[PDB]
């Protein structure tokens, strides 16, 4: 009962400051113009102890599945190519992506209805809302 309230199928309604977050991260110009127009719709499912995270957009679909606090490899849909850990930290995934020395914390949150990710690079942050879909 792991990630019950995560669990489900949710598309992405609202975005603040995402292209200064990808400017952070290292994102060139064209790739964050197209990136940034997606709508990606998230489908978090959970099987025993392993949690699968996908994101169909037309930018790009991407799927990642762990386990909290397994260190896995992961391609970004950036293309980065890192080594991410998730975590539950009083309710909340807890995504930490480490590249070349960097490092960059990906949150997910359960806000009433609605799942709120609040993405970290340095000083900048960005937060993406998602509805039920
Ligand atoms: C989601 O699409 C892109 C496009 C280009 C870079 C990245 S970095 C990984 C992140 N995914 C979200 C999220 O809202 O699910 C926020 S941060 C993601």
Redesign the pocket.
Same mark, same amino acid.
């Given at each position: 009962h792991m990630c019950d309230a995560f669990v489900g199928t949710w598309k992405?309604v609202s !975005?603040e400051n995402?292209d200064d977050?990808?400017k952070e991260?290292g994102?060139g110009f064209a790739?964050?113009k197209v990136?940034?127009m997606?709508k990606?719709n998230?489908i978090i499912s959970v099987n025993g102890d392993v949690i699968t995270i996908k !994101?169909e !957009?037309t930018?790009?679909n991407?799927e990642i599945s762990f386990i909290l606090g397994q260190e896995f490899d992961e391609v970004?849909?950036?293309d980065?190519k890192v080594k991410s850990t998730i975590t539950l930290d009083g309710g909340v995934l807890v995504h930490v992506?480490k590249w070349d020395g960097k490092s960059?914390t990906?949150k997910?949150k359960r806000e009433d209805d609605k799942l709120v990710?609040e993405?970290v690079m340095k000083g900048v942050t !960005?937060t993406?809302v998602?509805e039920r879909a």
């Open positions: 992405l !975005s995402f977050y990808m991260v994102v790739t964050r990136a940034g997606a990606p998230m !994101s !957009s930018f790009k991407t970004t849909a950036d980065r992506q960059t990906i997910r990710v993405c !960005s993406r998602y």
